[PDB]
């Protein structure tokens, strides 16, 4: 009779209707992705338009239900998320201009091709060739030219776009009773109405600062170690006291440092743990690889996947006649249907990618009982984090020996682990200063504290203190270098990569101690421990129904950000880094002495 029962009935109508409409759009997207055809594109467009229109009308209906008198945690969560205006809070022209701005900068970056001058006959696009020109080349000038040319062309054609992008996104948030567009992204971690577990939108920056203050001491030795390693490759271009050149990061923005594993290898003679040759020798096809993962997922306690996955998921490239998306994507179509789009090859990475992607789908069946709108993770970081521990556990030598990939007589000495430890540190610890820095620049520019003519120099100054990477040359306001990133050029939150890093390591220790492991973190194999999976399933089964602070404390016991697990796993590397950094200079200086 009251408003609340009306919302409950209204939500009941929405939940059943949305699932079928979501499935049709998801099925259209699945067909479009695995079969790129003209009819498939318009099918996704028509389904996507109907799905967008359905969300529009549902949001308008729910806005008539006040949030103040909603008494249980479940109902208010769905109505708060469903009442989100998005870009509709402003006028049509303002919304369309932002959407057009969103559309055009996506096209500019996707079609952004920078090539060598003086030969316009053919040019090299960003994806196929520009990726290899910085990840395998050893030429300082070639990397420098590619670094400067791409940001020069893209920055100039994105600077007017980024001027309106930051303002328009701020308009949408401020019209939605938000301080800025940065607070809009910070609202994912907001917890309100729950005692003890309450979390504030603005509390994220200081909490991330609290965990970051301990990341730098480990990163500083890593920074000194790579700089000493980079001295062999570049003797004079990089000063021992200065920062690293921006175009010698192995990638475009320095997010992943895995491209310097060969350059910064601690023991090049010592073999790695890779057993890729075992799969081809024993004829382990991708069909059986997923069986091995499925055999692994049932060992830890997760139930085996349904038979519908086999007849609906394509794990091999269709061929030349059919065009399918090779990007690793997990598909939760709804209504009990789960698929994974896989162009799997016979490689170690694809085996780890599969384990990473089944972790996404295995998370999906966990919250299947929850309503469709709540059929999501508690925060953005949980979904990827739970799949990362699956790859971490599957990458252990004990797991490889258990399933026969690695020989039981293999010697797991400390020499073959530090290089394995270093490679993970390059991928994980390397992105931590960069992820916080650009995002911290991103919230701050959303806040407006940064002067409109003081973005890059402030950005460059942060790179001197946070990541310790020096710029090739100073850049003025004509170029827009930050917008060159794939995520920012598509309105994608980047702090989620930072949170999933801590979540992955937080989950591991709680998972490992529940498995009763007497060894270090890098030797933790969660296999054959069904009790650990049940405790893991406790957070999995909650999904978005419970706050992330409550969900975190269910497993690890801490509702807030925790940096302690990260130091434990790299402790053998952290002490080892101190051994070889006695001659090198720990830390870095803001001076531009190198270049």
């Amino acid at each position: 009779s009251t408003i609340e029962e009306q919302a409950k009935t209204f939500l009941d109508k929405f939940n059943h209707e949305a699932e079928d409409l979501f499935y049709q759009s998801s099925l259209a997207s699945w067909n479009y992705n695995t079969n790129i055809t003209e009819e498939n594109v318009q099918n996704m467009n028509n389904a996507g338009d109907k799905w967008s229109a359905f969300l529009k009308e549902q949001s308008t209906l729910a806005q008539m239900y006040p949030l103040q008198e909603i008494q249980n945690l479940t109902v208010k969560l769905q109505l708060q998320a469903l009442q989100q205006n998005g870009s509709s809070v402003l006028s049509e022209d303002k919304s369309k201009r932002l959407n057009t701005i969103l559309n055009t900068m996506s096209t500019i970056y996707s079609t952004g091709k920078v090539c060598n001058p003086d030969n316009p006959q053919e040019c090299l696009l960003l994806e196929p060739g520009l990726n290899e020109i910085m990840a395998n080349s050893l030429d300082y000038n070639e990397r420098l030219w590619a670094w400067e040319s791409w940001r020069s062309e893209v920055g100039k054609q994105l600077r007017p776009l980024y001027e309106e992008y930051v303002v328009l996104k701020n308009e949408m948030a401020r019209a939605n009773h938000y301080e800025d567009y940065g607070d809009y992204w910070r609202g994912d971690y907001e917890v309100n109405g729950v005692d003890g577990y309450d979390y504030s939108r603005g509390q994220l920056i200081e909490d991330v600062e609290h965990t970051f203050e301990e990341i730098k001491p480990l990163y500083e030795h890593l920074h000194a170690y790579v700089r000493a390693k980079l001295m062999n490759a570049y003797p004079s271009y990089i000063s021992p006291i200065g920062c690293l050149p921006a175009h010698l990061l192995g990638d475009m923005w320095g997010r992943f440092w895995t491209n310097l594993y060969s350059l910064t290898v601690p023991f090049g003679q010592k073999p790695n743990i890779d057993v890729t040759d075992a799969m081809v020798d024993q004829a382990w096809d991708a069909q059986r690889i997923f069986k091995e993962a499925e055999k692994f997922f049932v060992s830890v306690g997760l139930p085996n996947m349904t038979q519908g996955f086999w007849e609906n998921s394509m794990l091999t490239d269709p061929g030349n006649v059919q065009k399918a998306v090779c990007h690793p994507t997990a598909w939760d179509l709804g209504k009990g249907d789960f698929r994974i789009l896989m162009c799997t090859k016979v490689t170690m990475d694809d085996f780890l990618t599969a384990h990473h992607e089944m972790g996404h789908i295995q998370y999906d069946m966990a919250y299947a009982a929850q309503p469709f709108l709540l059929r999501n993770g508690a925060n953005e970081g949980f979904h990827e984090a739970v799949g990362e521990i699956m790859s971490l556990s599957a990458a252990t030598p004990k797991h490889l020996k258990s399933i026969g990939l690695l020989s039981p007589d293999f010697q797991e000495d400390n020499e073959t682990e530090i290089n394995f430890l270093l490679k993970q540190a390059l991928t994980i610890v390397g992105t931590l200063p960069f992820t916080y820095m650009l995002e911290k620049w991103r919230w701050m520019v959303f806040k407006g504290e940064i002067p409109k003519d003081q973005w890059m120099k402030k950005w460059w100054e942060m790179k001197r203190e946070i990541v310790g990477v020096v710029e090739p040359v100073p850049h003025d306001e004509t170029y827009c270098d930050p917008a060159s990133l794939f995520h920012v050029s598509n309105d994608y939150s980047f702090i989620r990569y930072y949170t999933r890093t801590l979540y992955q390591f937080q989950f591991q220790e709680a998972l490992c101690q529940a498995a009763k492991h007497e060894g270090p973190l890098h030797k933790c194999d969660i296999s054959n421990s069904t009790e650990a999976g049940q405790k893991l399933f406790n957070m999995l089964r909650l999904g978005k129904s419970e706050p992330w602070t409550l969900a975190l404390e269910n497993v690890v016991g801490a509702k807030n950000m925790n940096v302690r697990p990260l130091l434990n796993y790299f402790e053998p590397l952290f002490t080892w880094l101190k051994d070889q950094n006695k001659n090198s200079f720990v830390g870095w200086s803001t001076d531009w002495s190198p270049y």
Binding site: S1, Q6, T9, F10, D12, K13, H16, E17, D20, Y23, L27, L61, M64, T306, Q307, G308, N312, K335, G336, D337, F338
Partner: protein, 97 residues
């Protein structure tokens, strides 16, 4: 009944009653199509705000999970009254000796 009650485009011929003002009595059929009254405002025959059609059509397809595939259910109800029991089981016949 996936092979029979499912179509690739969707078998919408099967409907279920999503809303009703009260729970059904045992062995009771409700085929009413009156718009459900979810709010205090009268429906007036219009499926608008807080007013929706009580019956929803199942979109059965052969590409669903085990729990969502159509299942034909035949329910047998047995009663004994003062009237003679005229429904018997088969009786076995043994060869004559």
């Amino acid at each position: 009944s996936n092979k029979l009650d499912s179509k690739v485009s969707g078998n919408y011929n099967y409907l279920y009653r999503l809303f009703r003002k009260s729970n059904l009595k045992p062995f009771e059929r409700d085929i009413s199509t009156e718009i459900y009254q979810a709010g205090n405002k009268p429906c007036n025959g219009v499926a608008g705000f807080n007013c929706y059609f009580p019956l929803r059509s199942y979109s059965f397809r052969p590409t669903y999970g085990v729990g969502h595939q159509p299942y034909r259910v035949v329910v047998l109800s047995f009663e004994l009254l003062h009237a003679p029991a005229t429904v018997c089981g088969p009786k076995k016949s043994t060869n004559l000796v």
